[PDB]
């Protein structure tokens with residue numbers, strides 16, 4: 001139904017790469033194309049599921065899914081985002097954000113994640129790398145991909161993936177936004193895994209910036225609760241951020 005006939009898509013410069021590679025493309029304007037290539041049965045399965053999940057999504061902070069192509073090769077085309085991911089801006093570009101932009105980023109990410117969970121969709125790998133800033137003001141959530149242990153919840157470390165795992169990952173992003181640096185900065189990787197997995201280790205909330213609102217730190221701590229059931233739902237935290245963002249205005 002959303003299939004793009006062959007010949008319409010023009011594939012351009014290569015961006016990323018084993019299962020598939022993504023290119024910048026032109027289809028009624030700037031678009032991104034993720035192409036396949038032997039296609040593994042799991043790879044074909046993931047291709048089917050990604051199209052199935054993406055078509056059910058129509059939200060501004062969720063990466064716009066424009067279509068899929070089959071004739072030349074299996075491919076999925078999405079909107080082209082100009083800018084860099086949240087991970088690059090915070091930890092690689094060494095660019096300090098105004099607090100209003102930070103809460104706006106957390107507010108925007110909260111909207112998309114709440115939209116996903118409202119659609120019974122779980123974003124199993126949520127992290128600063130998977131948050132893209134279109135232009136520099138609008139955030140787009142997508143699967144721009146072991147490498148993401150820091151965002152993994154205690155239960156997923158021990159053994160699983162659920163809404164509670166997603167909201168915990170949202171907490172680390174809150175820690176990244178407010179502190180400006182990766183969690184567990186003091187620590188090595190095996191030491192972090194065992195300590196966090198056993199519950200001995202938790203991010204250092206004192207490192208947060210002074211301008212951080214009191215409600216945000218409390219909200220951040222609530223998301224990082226070791227008990228899965230203790231973590232708040234995305235409707236609650238979206239309302240809290242938006243209410244706080246409204247007050248700041």
Ligand SMILES: CC(C)n1nc(C#Cc2cccc3cc(-c4cccc(C(F)(F)F)c4)ncc23)c2c(N)ncnc21
Pocket residue numbers: 015016022032033034050053054062063076077078079080081082116122123141142143144
């Ligand atoms: C960083 C740089 C190399 N890169 N990679 C871009 C891309 C892309 C995608 C292409 C085709 C299908 C996709 C599906 C998903 C996906 C899958 C499952 C769940 C979710 C969700 F749950 F998280 F939503 C999202 N994510 C991304 C793409 C990209 C871009 N589109 N624009 C600028 N730079 C870009």
